[model samples]
Target: GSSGSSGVNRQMLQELVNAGCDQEMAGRALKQTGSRSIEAALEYISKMSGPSSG
Candidate 1:
């Protein structure tokens, strides 16, 4: 179950897609990071993908 909430920025979401992250993953990343920062989202995605990635 879920309720309405503001969505992530389309521009940032596009950028995330440009950066090789899935659109769905990008949104989740932005929400979880709670900063709407591409770098932060990327970092979060990186961690989720694999901590061994360096």
Candidate 2:
């Protein structure tokens, strides 16, 4: 898991949701990347291997 500082911002989380990720998966990706950008979150999603996504 992420040893990052905290969870994702609501805006970034919403972007991920708009991009097609569910709320749960988007939050996980942003948490891991510690990024507010949808780009980074999407990259993290692509690299994810567990049930957070599918």
Candidate 3:
């Protein structure tokens, strides 16, 4: 099943990159999110690092 995880993951990855997070760090963070929704990952990142401008 797609479960929308991939799409969410992609968005999170992009957001992280846009936010200036290194590719490796963003990938690690995304993996840590596991099967969680993209929104969840985004929220986690936002809480930890604040909003992104890109």
Candidate 4:
């Protein structure tokens, strides 16, 4: 994916980190949940970045 099309924005990343995701984990999760749409990427990142109680 092109760097610009990856849907990995600084704001979204910051939001993920603010939501309690580790910086490295957030970056990796975003890479794993590759999406063309920013909204979809945000959704995936949000789901993966949320606290994992289990």
Best by TM-score: 1
Write the residue-wise lDDT of candidate 2 on 1-54 in tens digits.
Answer: 268745468776777789687797788878888865888887777775555554
Q: How well is each residue in 1-54 modelled by candidate 1, as lDDT tens digits?
A: 148656667677788679687877888888787746888898888875674754
Question: What lDDT does model 2 reach?
Answer: 0.73
Supply the global lDDT for candidate 3. 0.60
User: How does each model score on lDDT?
Assistant: 0.77, 0.73, 0.60, 0.59
lDDT tens per residue, model 4, 1-54: 476565556666776677566787666656666523344444666575657442
| CA deviation > 4 Å runs, candidate 1 | 1-5, 49-54
Better of 3 and 4 by lDDT: 3
> Per-residue alpha-carbon lDDT of model 3 for 1-54, expressed as tens digits?
266534236665776578566676666656777636545555656677755533
The prediction achieving the highest lDDT against the true structure is 1
**Lowest-sum lDDT 10-residue window in model 2:** 45-54
Residue pairs in collision within model 1: none
Better of 1 and 4 by TM-score: 1
Candidate 1 global lDDT: 0.77
- Backbone clash pairs for candidate 4 read none
Which ten-residue region of model 1 has the weakest summed lDDT?
Answer: 1-10
Off by over 4 Å in 2: 1-6, 49-54
Q: What value does the lDDT take at residue 32 in candidate 1?
A: 86
